[PDB]
Design a protein around this motif. Structure first.
Motif, mmCIF file in Angstrom:
data_model
loop_
_atom_site.group_PDB
_atom_site.id
_atom_site.type_symbol
_atom_site.label_atom_id
_atom_site.label_comp_id
_atom_site.label_asym_id
_atom_site.label_seq_id
_atom_site.Cartn_x
_atom_site.Cartn_y
_atom_site.Cartn_z
ATOM 1 N N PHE A 166 39.011 109.063 -13.466
ATOM 2 C CA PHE A 166 39.444 107.665 -13.906
ATOM 3 C C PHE A 166 40.134 107.893 -15.205
ATOM 4 O O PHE A 166 40.950 106.928 -15.693
ATOM 5 C CB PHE A 166 38.397 106.795 -13.987
ATOM 6 N N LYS A 167 39.520 108.688 -16.283
ATOM 7 C CA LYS A 167 40.120 109.006 -17.523
ATOM 8 C C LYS A 167 41.677 109.099 -17.553
ATOM 9 O O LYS A 167 42.193 109.969 -16.939
ATOM 10 C CB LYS A 167 39.423 110.174 -18.077
ATOM 11 N N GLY A 168 42.235 108.158 -18.371
ATOM 12 C CA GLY A 168 43.725 108.122 -18.363
ATOM 13 C C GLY A 168 44.521 107.464 -17.250
ATOM 14 O O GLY A 168 45.769 107.195 -17.593
ATOM 15 N N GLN A 169 43.841 106.814 -16.497
ATOM 16 C CA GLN A 169 44.443 106.123 -15.120
ATOM 17 C C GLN A 169 43.493 104.757 -14.985
ATOM 18 O O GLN A 169 43.931 104.264 -13.967
ATOM 19 C CB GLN A 169 44.451 106.982 -14.031
ATOM 20 N N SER A 174 43.016 99.612 -12.563
ATOM 21 C CA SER A 174 42.514 98.219 -12.756
ATOM 22 C C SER A 174 43.530 97.068 -12.064
ATOM 23 O O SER A 174 42.929 96.221 -11.592
ATOM 24 C CB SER A 174 42.150 97.942 -14.233
ATOM 25 N N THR A 175 44.573 97.749 -11.828
ATOM 26 C CA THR A 175 45.572 96.612 -11.415
ATOM 27 C C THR A 175 45.814 97.198 -9.838
ATOM 28 O O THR A 175 46.658 96.554 -9.123
ATOM 29 C CB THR A 175 46.953 96.813 -12.007
ATOM 30 N N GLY A 179 41.007 99.840 -6.566
ATOM 31 C CA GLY A 179 40.541 100.319 -7.951
ATOM 32 C C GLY A 179 39.986 99.340 -8.826
ATOM 33 O O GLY A 179 39.034 99.713 -9.621
ATOM 34 N N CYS A 180 40.378 98.137 -8.709
ATOM 35 C CA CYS A 180 39.666 97.232 -9.647
ATOM 36 C C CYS A 180 38.387 96.981 -9.433
ATOM 37 O O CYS A 180 37.436 96.527 -10.103
ATOM 38 C CB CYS A 180 40.400 95.897 -9.469
ATOM 39 N N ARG A 181 37.847 97.214 -7.998
ATOM 40 C CA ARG A 181 36.552 96.994 -7.563
ATOM 41 C C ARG A 181 35.686 98.074 -8.082
ATOM 42 O O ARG A 181 34.662 97.870 -8.638
ATOM 43 C CB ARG A 181 36.503 97.047 -6.061
ATOM 44 N N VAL A 182 36.240 99.246 -7.822
ATOM 45 C CA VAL A 182 35.385 100.670 -8.364
ATOM 46 C C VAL A 182 35.373 100.410 -10.031
ATOM 47 O O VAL A 182 34.278 100.895 -10.359
ATOM 48 C CB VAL A 182 36.161 101.922 -8.099
ATOM 49 N N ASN A 216 43.299 91.017 -13.840
ATOM 50 C CA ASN A 216 42.282 89.735 -14.390
ATOM 51 C C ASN A 216 40.787 89.717 -14.076
ATOM 52 O O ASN A 216 39.953 89.387 -14.961
ATOM 53 C CB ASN A 216 43.074 88.376 -14.026
ATOM 54 N N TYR A 217 40.501 90.315 -12.946
ATOM 55 C CA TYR A 217 39.102 90.340 -12.544
ATOM 56 C C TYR A 217 38.524 91.223 -13.145
ATOM 57 O O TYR A 217 37.157 90.953 -13.689
ATOM 58 C CB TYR A 217 39.027 90.711 -11.091
ATOM 59 N N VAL A 218 38.894 92.321 -13.694
ATOM 60 C CA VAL A 218 38.238 93.391 -14.549
ATOM 61 C C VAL A 218 37.849 92.998 -15.935
ATOM 62 O O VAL A 218 36.845 93.024 -16.390
ATOM 63 C CB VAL A 218 38.778 94.636 -14.646
ATOM 64 N N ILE A 219 38.808 92.244 -16.533
ATOM 65 C CA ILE A 219 38.698 91.494 -17.921
ATOM 66 C C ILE A 219 37.867 90.562 -17.683
ATOM 67 O O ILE A 219 36.822 90.200 -18.636
ATOM 68 C CB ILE A 219 40.002 90.978 -18.405
#
Length: 341
Positions: A166-169, A174-175, A179-182, A216-219
């Motif tokens: 995930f680092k750097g990505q 997140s969009t 991935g936003c779930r993970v 927006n869900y991650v934030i």
RNA sequence: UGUACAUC
């Protein structure tokens, strides 16, 4: 194709059919819509000996059932209600196939179930099989649910390789729809050394993220479950932009969370921003009241405002009360006001 | 009055 027993069974000729009467036919019944139901039902309350009879006929070909539209349910039932030895033996049948199963429409359900019930040594061994395939799984409609389950069930230290990927990505992921779930599962279950870098990239891309369909869900997630220092950084990105973002289909949800989860001081500042700031002739607050999304932010502000500040809002609103009636979304503010009068 | 998250 179907044995006489199975056909005769679907033809309702055995209302009193017991597990022990389908000896020799477990695999066939397991792959049959009705037979699979018959077995599942019978299993939860079967005797250890009955359970073992059924197990004996599925062990060798267990993989075949795990990726089967009906059979996957019979496997899961052993992970839930089978014996410890049966669960260990099923795990052994998975060895070497985790990737393949995790990408599989039905197999991925077995992987998920197994993770919940096997000892950590076996968990850790399943996880290592995804080594080198993190993004492939995270972006897969079946696999992302498996990566989520790993994060929820497995020791966080064994998940370091997922973090590395995930680092750097983090922005890109997140969009992403999966991935936003993970990312959210990581924020919930992972170690400080693991969440830190991820939080750094989220902070770097907050402006973009609050407006994104999935970002927006991650934030929002950080606002509801995050540390105060992380909430405040987000709140600082919303400040000066309250009016505009609350008019936005996606970001308006985030400004509500800021209002709700900000510190006392930060909440008072955000509400004041739109009581003070003028959008042309009248206040930002008045424009918000008439907006399809912004009207929701106002109501949330009325909800959480300190009584003293609530009075200021009500006073800003009061002069427009009769005109609000003319606006589709204005009307909705009036509904809120009744509660407070 | 407004956005995500999968089998018999």
């Amino acid at each position: 194709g179907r044995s006489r027993l199975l056909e005769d069974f679907r033809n309702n000729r055995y209302p009193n059919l017991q597990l022990r009467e389908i000896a020799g036919h477990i695999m066939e019944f397991s792959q049959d819509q009705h037979g699979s139901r018959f077995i599942q039902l019978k299993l939860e309350r079967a005797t250890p000996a009955e359970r073992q009879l059924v197990f004996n006929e599925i062990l060798q070909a267990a993989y075949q059932l795990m990726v089967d539209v009906f059979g996957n349910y019979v496997i899961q039932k052993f992970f839930e209600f089978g014996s410890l030895e049966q669960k260990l033996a099923l795990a052994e049948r998975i060895r070497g196939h985790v990737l393949s199963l995790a990408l599989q429409m039905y197999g991925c359900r077995v992987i998920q179930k197994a993770l919940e019930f096997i000892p950590s040594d076996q968990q850790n061994e399943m996880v290592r099989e995804l080594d080198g395939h993190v993004l492939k799984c995270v972006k897969d409609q079946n696999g992302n649910h498996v990566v989520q389950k790993c994060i929820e069930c497995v020791q966080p230290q064994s998940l370091q390789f997922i973090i590395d990927a995930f680092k750097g990505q983090v922005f890109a992921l997140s969009t992403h729809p999966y991935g936003c779930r993970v990312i959210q599962r990581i924020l919930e279950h992972c170690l400080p050394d693991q969440t830190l870098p991820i939080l750094e990239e989220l902070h770097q891309h907050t402006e973009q993220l609050v407006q994104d369909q999935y970002g927006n869900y991650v934030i929002q997630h950080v606002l509801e479950h995050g540390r105060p220092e992380d909430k405040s950084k987000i709140v600082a990105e919303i400040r000066g932009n309250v009016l505009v973002l609350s008019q936005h289909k996606f970001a308006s949800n985030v400004v509500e969370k800021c209002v709700t989860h900000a510190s006392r001081t930060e909440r008072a500042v955000l509400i004041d921003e739109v009581c003070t700031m003028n959008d042309g002739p009248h206040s930002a607050l008045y424009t918000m009241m008439k907006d399809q999304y912004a009207n929701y932010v106002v109501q949330k502000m009325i909800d959480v405002a300190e009584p003293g500040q609530r009075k200021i809002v009500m006073h800003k609103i009061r002069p427009h009360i009769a005109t609000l009636r003319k606006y589709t979304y204005g009307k909705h503010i009036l509904a809120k006001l009744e509660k407070y009068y």
